[PDB]
Scaffold this active site. Structure first.
Site, PDB file in Angstrom:
ATOM      1  N   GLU A  83      70.036 -14.393  75.433  1.00 38.41           N
ATOM      2  CA  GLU A  83      69.639 -14.561  76.911  1.00 38.41           C
ATOM      3  C   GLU A  83      69.784 -13.279  77.677  1.00 38.41           C
ATOM      4  O   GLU A  83      70.404 -13.278  78.830  1.00 38.41           O
ATOM      5  CB  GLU A  83      70.790 -15.581  77.348  1.00 38.41           C
ATOM      6  N   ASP A  84      69.028 -12.333  77.319  1.00 41.18           N
ATOM      7  CA  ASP A  84      68.807 -11.141  77.950  1.00 41.18           C
ATOM      8  C   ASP A  84      70.204 -10.176  77.991  1.00 41.18           C
ATOM      9  O   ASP A  84      70.151  -9.202  79.004  1.00 41.18           O
ATOM     10  CB  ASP A  84      68.294 -11.159  79.164  1.00 41.18           C
ATOM     11  N   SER A  85      71.122 -10.650  77.327  1.00 40.45           N
ATOM     12  CA  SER A  85      72.451  -9.951  77.432  1.00 40.45           C
ATOM     13  C   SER A  85      72.338  -8.506  76.652  1.00 40.45           C
ATOM     14  O   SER A  85      71.209  -8.314  75.893  1.00 40.45           O
ATOM     15  CB  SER A  85      73.522 -10.743  77.051  1.00 40.45           C
ATOM     16  N   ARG A  99      58.710 -12.437  79.582  1.00 35.97           N
ATOM     17  CA  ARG A  99      58.677 -11.554  80.768  1.00 35.97           C
ATOM     18  C   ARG A  99      58.108 -10.264  80.344  1.00 35.97           C
ATOM     19  O   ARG A  99      58.829  -9.361  79.868  1.00 35.97           O
ATOM     20  CB  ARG A  99      59.889 -11.420  81.469  1.00 35.97           C
TER      21      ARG A  99
END
Ligand SMILES: [Zn+2]
Ligand SMILES: [Zn+2]
Ligand SMILES: [Zn+2]
Ligand SMILES: [Zn+2]
Lengths: 44, 468, 49, 436, 135, 44, 67, 49, 114, 257, 82
Positions: free
Chosen positions: B98-100, B269
């Site tokens: 989750e984009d961490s 994205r």
RNA sequence: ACACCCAGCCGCAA
């Protein structure tokens, strides 16, 4: 923006506190526009 | 009739610092331009002379290797907002999801994204009464009433904190006591979760002539694993875990990455400009010149950058073989490596944490107050109680709104429904308007509803408790 | 106005600061430009309802 | 005064094993707030499980979430029997488990599940440590001589608990395989079949382990129970992540570069599309374009132009997808179903495509021209919003500004419509709150 | 009842999955002939369907209501559990059939609606969660 | 109690609660010197 | 602000090379040759010396608050 | 009538949806090694609560 | 504010032991080593050295969590050879391994220095 | 069943870089030796600093961090000084730590560069690496810096200032033979430094009976420790850790029986 | 009502399961006698769940029909869904 | 045995 006793008809949002987190943030906040709108047509 | 002076003057102040914005997606450019204002660093050079609330400054600001020709004209080179970081785009452990991100605790110990948090307070001797005056002095244990259990010995005889001392949470930091109409302690206190260091304190006179002072408390912020980070391409992320240098992967030449961002931040994205940034940063750091990354240039594309990188002894697409930090075995895939510009964001893990347990209570609502600064409690909204209506946990939903928030006991008549008076010690339960002294029933019911029905009875409305 | 780098640094004022902000009670205030409909210009509009 | 007689109450600190409940605004549905078990960890954040991020519609990029601790023997028990995430894997919204493998573990299951992967004794050796429901017996390897090699399907068979029977199809399932021969052979190794708790063929993907009706986790919940499903999820997230620790996943420039022949084909397709739209606008200029019945002449001209450019973008996306190699991670992320789509692959590599505002193309803000750079009275592809270039090749400033308009409206619509959906929420649920 | 040939329809417990479970638990061989008399299947289905209660009663009104509520599951149950289908493609045995009947009874009794469940708030939350995905 | 002034830097004690001034410059901004008491700082 | 003593990735000494880097830049050398003359073969220290901007000359233009 | 009113009022913003003791809010962080039901809690929150 | 002091990664306070022995009940002749306050540095060594032993069936290691400085090693051998003495042999040949490597590195340094 | 027979060969032994090759050894052993290089090699570094007067624009925390990460030579006496936690000495003693005194004052017009040379120790065998010098802080006229610093003993697990290496590079199987990495386009990858192929060949042929061996090290010190004694210190630390494991396991197995 | 003419689904649902498992466990918390033998555990939830498995819970459930008439069910004739 | 009153506005987080 206006008389103190006429704050109901006075437009708000003018003269915000200057952002100083970043030099880029400062130069962004100096050069900023705003619309008097409180429909998506003016936002486009 | 006219020609463009240069096509890259379309962007504003925030959008200029993004390199290759055409290679990015416009929502990501919008996000990073919104988040470029939140990137800390040096902001104004006379930061130690100035003092103001919520001021951040960073240890080692670095101008970006991948730069455009317009941030040099915004004077971004003089005052940067981040560090060029060796970044491995990899799914190493699982803490990047989750984009961490995973960061290097060895690098963090070396000053990587370590920063200083300056905060300042101010107080005044606003004289109001004739004898009701407040004077900067050391409060004595018995001459004034507003006591806490904080350490009052850290102050000098003037009533102000000495600079350079260490202060912890819930400590007195300016000692002012207002005299009673002997005195009352109206001193200010350091807010929770600060553990900062006082740096510089001044005294002066205000516009209206009396004494006035400001302090300044600084606290270094070693990055814990909650801090908000982003690139120059809309790469929102929080620090998942900080491994040491022996635990993360490493190249054949010994390069260990600083920040590992998950590979699935790219396809959804679409941030191909971040990859182009990483490639140009690798070739610029290997060459020596500062990378030219103006938004619209036909002389610079991925092929010439790839050839320039391949000339210098690396993979022409920017990949590099990494070895597992734990096992030592070669990673089967080839991780994309290279320096790139990340920024540290204002939103702190230490400033956002909050816990509440039957603390301060609102005077009107008899309920928890409005947020962490006031040591209040979290809201449990309409849509939250509807979640229990869907779940079917009636007693959790009762305890969440009655027992833990505001339990209260009322006395109400049984003939009428009007709230009745009740003396506790003498036990004389009597309801006015009915001459009833034998039928008043105790009802457990929230204080918010009692104040509700009392506002209704102020409007000549009669909500009657027909308990029978 | 007119001060050089040396005079600004001697005066404890940042040369890099672009200015353009007021100081009211020690708080830096900046005026954000507010758009309004252009004056003295005839327009045409069509209200739907 | 610290003597504790019977009947007293002691407010202890929140030790490990306690039961709390997490919340994230907005709470759209009953999956969005529900119970967990407390595990005490260092540092200053909440640390929650990875596939649990699909119920609470969240991302680990700055989301802050609430905590609620019950204090009652009534309340802790009723939350333990109602609001636990093991007991409530499936939702009654669409009778499918919103509890689903996502973002990293799914695309690693895809690469761990293929035929070509083979583990030495030292690899299976460590992958069997990260289990919890393992019976303690090493299974017989699929390869013995010359050296013992374990395929990943036996490992995932050890993951699958009890005896689960399931038949799903992989995402890249060829439609001609079922009608013709090799229906149960599947040379592409599609047609996932799980037999008696043993994975038999197939590569797993979003259609098998994700949030889909009749998925493997759905059958695991409906047959084994609720605790066993929780152990199944935990075992997957341990062993697959620790195999990915060895084998490794990434993405880079080399996953975006296509062949020179591919680039020539894409440029030829774009040139042919531009020539065709020039031809049809030339037909419209000299008044030979017959109007579509029931449609305005401008409307049917715009429909024909949109049809031609959509056919062009479909063809260039198909060519870009056919040009992808097996090692391309952009292809792997979208065939696994973890994140992204093939349209994103087409926009990254070949062509971004036609860009629209409120349905129609880029309007005429100026005197019947989109930008001062373009000539007046132009309805061509470049002048009206089409992006012939790609993200990798860079954008010209005009099509960059049109993409800025597209991103702007994509922000505005999701920034203003939450007022409407939040009011529809409240209106629907205040009337329905008492129906039982 | 069903026009347009929409064969996809939601039912409580997935019949083909339990038949496959009964095949692969008792290790039956589809090649060999089985020992399962057709009327064992017939009165097994008939005696099973009298114990799937929704509208519990004895008067003909409640009996008609129970038949109406159980009709779709019954009309799928008799089609899936037919004698010819069992004798040809399922090839179940006697104790396999008994386990199948007992376990479908357990699954259907588990899948019944629990009294006290608030359907309105759950319905509003369920129907209203896709409101945030036409963006 | 000791204090240090704005520019000319004379260590002018006050100890009298009079309005702030100095006999050298008289600039009415005062700072206080870091005290002789001892504080330790970790290098971690 | 000031040059760090160590490279963030590895930990090679950086603090003893800023003055030498300016000295080699003053003697008509390019950035690549100056970085090669300082023994920085790895690009992690090359980006540390290359991308660091110094602010101390801006900060030492101010009068000190004490004496 | 404004006190009895809706959002930021009595019956919607004070009573039916209210604030509660014994609660915490913190930014969230990935953790693969925990179970589905397990969740990580910092020591300060567990101490204060 | 919840940052742990850095010394608990390898120090042991008063209350826990360095080595704890748990006997696994799922399979006969198995052990559950729970070596505390080391990292993968020891565990990889243990796994490799025990896989070098031919008469050991199962011997692997894992970490329960990267925060809790703890490793667990599960060793299963043939039913004539204890896992504890298998661990003892895998350490006492490792001591000779490291001492021999140290001696050869010493003599290589001595030979290289003239 | 027992330990194998490793061999070492040294290719370069300059004053700050050491390259050695270890053969006939499993992968985990070499990986652990690499990990111990940057995590568990003892070294003397500053951890306890006390600021007396700091008028610099660089405040106390900047100076504390910079002084903490200044390397200190510990070529001979790193074994002699014990850890401060294991010292029966309270607080600090010269046997358990090394005391540093820094005093500097600028009273000239040009900028005074306060470097690591200005650090003064008590024991002559502990000194920052000056025998260019490391910059700490620059001072204007009238700005002082007076402090005392104490140097403890620690390794890289506590903090990165106790990491003795500059940067370690670990290479095994240089030209790809065991397919530990799968190259999609093998012709696009440069050959390694220790590769043994010509220009035409891209990868080595497949070896099904192979095993990872012939490890290449390129360990590099930061100037604090000598680059040849760091390997000996790492091996000694690993040997002592496994001897402690021997003692603890023996105590536990006699306690259980 | 009497023993006859008693209609309600005999499957004890999850809501009253949670309610009983809460109430009886709180009764252990307020030192009530325990209906089952226990072997070395102290959590009231665990012993309450164990005796819910043992089906020896000494309370009855009064179910409110929507007509208004009550209907009493014990625990031992209700059968566990699990 | 804690101490900080509230309205309004603005910026900002997901
Ligand atoms: Zn009355
Ligand atoms: Zn003065
Ligand atoms: Zn470096
Ligand atoms: Zn000592």
């Amino acid at each position: 923006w206006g008389d103190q006793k006429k704050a109901h008809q006075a437009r708000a949002g003018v003269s915000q506190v200057l952002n100083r987190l970043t030099f880029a943030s400062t130069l962004s906040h100096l050069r900023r526009l705003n619309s008097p709108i409180g429909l998506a047509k003016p936002r486009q | 009739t006219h020609c463009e002076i240069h096509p890259s003057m379309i962007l504003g102040v925030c959008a200029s610092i993004i390199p290759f914005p055409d290679h990015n997606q416009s929502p990501r450019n919008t996000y990073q331009s919104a988040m470029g204002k939140q990137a800390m660093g040096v902001y104004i050079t006379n930061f130690h002379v100035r003092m103001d609330t919520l001021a951040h400054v960073l240890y080692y600001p670095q101008k970006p290797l991948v730069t455009t020709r317009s941030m040099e004209y915004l004077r971004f080179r003089e005052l940067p907002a981040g560090i060029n970081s060796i970044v491995a785009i990899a799914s190493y452990t699982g803490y990047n999801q989750e984009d961490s991100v995973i960061m290097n605790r060895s690098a963090v110990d070396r000053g990587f994204f370590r920063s200083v948090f300056y905060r300042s307070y101010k107080e005044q001797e606003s004289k109001k009464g004739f004898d009701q005056e407040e004077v900067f002095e050391k409060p004595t244990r018995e001459t004034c009433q507003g006591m806490r259990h904080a350490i009052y010995d850290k102050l000098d005889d003037d009533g102000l904190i000495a600079p350079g001392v260490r202060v912890s949470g819930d400590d007195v930091i300016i000692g002012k006591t207002v005299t009673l109409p002997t005195k009352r302690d109206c001193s200010t206190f350091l807010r929770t979760s600060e553990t900062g260091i006082v740096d510089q304190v001044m005294v002066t006179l205000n516009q209206e002539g009396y004494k006035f002072c400001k302090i300044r408390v600084r606290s270094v912020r070693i990055p814990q694993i909650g801090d908000k980070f982003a690139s120059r391409h809309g790469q929102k992320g929080t620090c998942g875990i900080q491994y040491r240098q022996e635990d993360m992967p490493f190249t054949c030449e010994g390069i260990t990455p600083d920040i590992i961002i998950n590979p699935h931040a790219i396809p959804s994205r679409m941030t191909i400009g971040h990859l182009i940034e990483c490639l140009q940063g690798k070739v610029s750091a290997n060459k020596g010149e500062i990378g030219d990354a103006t938004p619209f240039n036909d002389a610079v594309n991925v092929q010439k950058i790839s050839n320039l990188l391949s000339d210098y002894g690396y993979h022409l697409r920017g990949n590099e073989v990494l070895y597992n930090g734990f096992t030592g075995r070669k990673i089967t895939s080839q991780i994309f490596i290279g320096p790139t510009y990340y920024q540290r964001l204002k939103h702190m893990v230490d400033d956002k944490i909050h816990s509440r347990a039957r603390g301060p209570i609102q005077i009107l609502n008899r309920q928890p107050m409005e947020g962490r600064s006031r040591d209040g409690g979290l809201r449990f909204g309409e849509m939250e109680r509807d979640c229990q209506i869907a779940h079917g946990a009636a007693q959790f939903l009762r305890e969440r709104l009655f027992e833990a928030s505001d339990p209260y006991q009322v006395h109400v008549c049984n003939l009428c429904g009007i709230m009745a008076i009740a003396n506790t010690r003498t036990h004389t339960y009597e309801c006015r308007g009915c001459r009833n002294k034998t039928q008043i029933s105790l009802v457990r019911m929230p204080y918010a509803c009692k104040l509700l029905f009392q506002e209704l009875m102020s409007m000549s409305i009669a909500p009657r408790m027909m308990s029978v | 106005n007119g001060l050089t780098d040396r005079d600004l640094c001697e005066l404890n004022e940042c040369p890099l600061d672009p200015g353009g902000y007021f100081i009211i009670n020690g708080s830096e205030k900046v005026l954000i430009a507010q758009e309004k409909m252009a004056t003295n210009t005839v327009y045409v509009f069509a209200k739907k309802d | 005064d610290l003597h504790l007689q019977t009947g007293y109450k002691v407010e202890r600190h929140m030790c490990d094993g306690d039961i709390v409940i997490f919340n994230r605004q907005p709470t759209l549905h009953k999956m969005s707030m529900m119970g967990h078990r407390v595990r005490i960890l260092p540092w200053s954040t909440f640390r929650l499980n990875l596939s649990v991020t699909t119920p609470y519609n969240a991302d680990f990029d700055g989301d802050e979430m609430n905590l609620h601790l019950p204090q009652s023997l009534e309340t802790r028990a009723e939350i333990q029997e109602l609001a636990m995430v093991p007991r409530m894997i499936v939702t009654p919204q669409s009778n499918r488990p919103v509890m689903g493998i996502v973002q990293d573990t799914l695309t690693a299951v895809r690469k761990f599940t293929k035929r070509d992967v083979f583990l030495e004794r030292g690899e299976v050796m460590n992958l069997l440590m990260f289990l919890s429901t393992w019976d303690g017996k090493v299974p017989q390897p699929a390869i013995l001589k010359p050296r013992p090699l374990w395929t990943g399907k036996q490992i995932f068979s050890l993951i699958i608990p009890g005896h689960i029977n399931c038949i799903r199809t992989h995402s890249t399932h060829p439609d001609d395989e079922d009608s013709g021969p090799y229906k149960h052979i599947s040379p592409g190794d599609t047609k996932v079949v799980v037999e008696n708790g043993e994975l038999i063929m197939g590569i797993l993907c979003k259609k098998s382990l994700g949030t889909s009706a009749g998925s493997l986790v759905h059958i695991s919940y409906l047959e084994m129970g609720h605790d066993i499903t929780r152990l199944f999820y935990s075992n997957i997230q341990t062993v697959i992540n620790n195999w990915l620790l060895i084998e490794g996943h990434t993405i880079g420039i080399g996953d975006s570069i296509a062949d020179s022949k591919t680039y020539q084909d894409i440029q030829n397709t774009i040139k042919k599309a531009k020539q065709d739209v020039i031809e049809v606008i030339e037909k419209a200029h000299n008044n030979e374009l017959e109007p579509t019945p029931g449609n305005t002449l401008r409307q049917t001209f715009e429909n024909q132009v949109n049809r031609i450019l959509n056919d062009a973008r479909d063809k260039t996306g198909s060519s870009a997808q056919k040009s992808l190699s097996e090692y391309n991670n952009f292809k792997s992320m979208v065939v696994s179903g973890a994140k992204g789509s093939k349209i994103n692959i087409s926009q990254v590599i070949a062509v971004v495509g036609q860009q629209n505002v409120e349905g129609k193309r880029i309007p005429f803000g100026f005197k019947h021209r989109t930008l001062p750079h373009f000539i007046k009275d132009d309805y061509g592809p470049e002048s009206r919003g089409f992006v012939e270039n790609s993200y990798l090749a860079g954008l010209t400033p005009t099509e960059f500004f049109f993409h800025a308009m597209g991103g702007r409206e994509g922000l505005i619509d999701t920034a203003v419509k939450t007022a409407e959906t939040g009011y529809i929420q409240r209106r629907l649920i205040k009337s329905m709150e008492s129906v039982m | 009842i069903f026009p347009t040939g929409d064969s996809k329809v939601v039912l409580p417990c997935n019949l083909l999955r339990m038949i496959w479970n009964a095949q692969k638990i008792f290790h039956i061989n589809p090649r060999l002939p089985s020992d399962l008399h057709p009327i064992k299947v017939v009165e097994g289905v008939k005696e099973l369907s009298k114990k799937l209660v929704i509208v519990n009663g004895d008067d003909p009104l409640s009996r008609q209501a129970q038949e109406n509520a159980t009709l779709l599951f019954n009309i799928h149950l008799r089609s899936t559990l037919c004698s010819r289908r069992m004798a040809e493609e399922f090839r179940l045995s006697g104790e396999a059939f008994d386990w199948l009947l007992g376990e479908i009874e357990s699954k259907f009794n588990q899948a019944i609606a629990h009294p006290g469940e608030m359907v309105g708030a759950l319905a509003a939350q369920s129907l209203g969660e896709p409101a945030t995905q036409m963006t | 109690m000791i204090y240090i002034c704005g520019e000319c830097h004379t260590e002018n004690e006050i100890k009298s609660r009079d309005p702030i001034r100095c006999r050298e410059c008289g600039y009415r901004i005062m700072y206080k010197k870091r005290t002789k008491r001892l504080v330790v700082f970790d290098a971690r | 602000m000031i040059i760090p003593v160590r490279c963030f990735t590895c930990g090679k000494i950086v603090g003893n090379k800023w003055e030498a880097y300016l000295g080699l830049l003053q003697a008509e050398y390019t950035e690549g040759d100056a970085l090669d003359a300082l023994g920085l073969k790895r690009y992690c220290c090359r980006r540390m010396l290359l991308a660091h901007v110094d602010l101390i000359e801006k900060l030492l233009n101010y009068a000190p608050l004490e004496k | 009538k404004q006190r009895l009113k809706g959002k930021e009022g009595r019956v919607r913003g004070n009573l039916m949806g209210k604030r509660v003791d014994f609660s915490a809010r913190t930014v969230i962080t990935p953790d693969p090694n925990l179970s589905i039901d397990q969740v990580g809690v910092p020591r300060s929150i567990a101490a204060n609560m | 504010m919840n940052a742990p002091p850095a010394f608990e990664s390898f120090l042991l306070f008063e209350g826990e032991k360095k080595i704890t022995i748990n006997k696994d009940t799922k399979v006969p002749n198995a052990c559950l080593f729970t070596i505390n306050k080391e990292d993968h540095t020891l565990g990889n060594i243990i796994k490799s050295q025990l896989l070098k032993d031919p008469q050991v069936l199962f011997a692997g290691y894992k970490v329960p969590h990267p925060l809790e400085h703890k490793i667990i090693i599960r060793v299963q051998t043939t039913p004539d050879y204890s896992p504890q003495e298998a661990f003892t042999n895998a350490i006492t040949d490792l001591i000779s391994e490291l001492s021999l490597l140290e001696e050869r590195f010493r003599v290589a340094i001595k030979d290289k220095q003239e | 069943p027992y330990a194998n027979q490793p061999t070492v060969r040294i290719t370069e032994l300059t004053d700050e870089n050491v390259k050695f090759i270890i053969e006939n050894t499993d992968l985990a052993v070499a990986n652990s030796i690499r990990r111990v290089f940057i995590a568990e090699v003892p070294i003397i570094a500053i951890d306890w600093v006390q600021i007396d007067a700091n008028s610099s624009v660089l405040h106390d925390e900047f100076i504390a961090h910079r002084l903490g990460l200044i390397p200190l030579t510990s070529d001979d006496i790193v074994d002699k000084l014990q850890y401060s936690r294991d010292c029966t000495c309270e607080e600090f003693c010269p046997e358990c730590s090394v005391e540093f005194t820094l005093d500097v004052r600028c009273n000239e017009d040009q900028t005074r560069h306060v470097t690591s040379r200005d650090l003064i120790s008590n024991s002559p065998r502990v000194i920052p690496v000056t025998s260019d010098d490391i910059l700490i802080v620059k001072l204007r006229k009238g700005q002082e810096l007076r402090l005392r610093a104490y140097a403890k003993k620690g390794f890289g697990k506590e903090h990165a200032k106790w990491n003795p290496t500059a940067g370690v590079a670990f290479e095994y199987d240089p030209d790809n033979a065991l397919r530990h990495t799968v190259y999609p386009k093998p012709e696009e990858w440069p050959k390694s430094e220790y590769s043994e192929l010509d220009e035409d060949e891209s990868q080595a042929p497949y070896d099904p009976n192979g095993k990872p061996e012939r490890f290449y090290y390129n360990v590099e010190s930061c100037g604090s420790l000598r680059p040849e004694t760091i390997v000996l210190s790492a091996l000694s630390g690993l040997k002592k850790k496994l001897s402690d494991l021997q003692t603890q396991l023996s105590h536990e197995i006699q306690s259980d029986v | 009502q009497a023993n006859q003419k008693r209609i309600t689904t005999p499957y004890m649902t999850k809501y009253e399961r949670a309610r009983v498992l809460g109430t009886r466990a709180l009764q252990i918390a307020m030192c009530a006698p325990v209906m089952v033998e226990l072997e070395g555990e102290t959590d009231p939830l665990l012993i309450a769940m164990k005796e819910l498995k043992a089906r020896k819970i000494p309370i009855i459930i009064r179910r409110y029909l929507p007509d208004g008439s009550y209907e009493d069910w014990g625990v031992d004739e209700l059968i566990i869904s699990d």
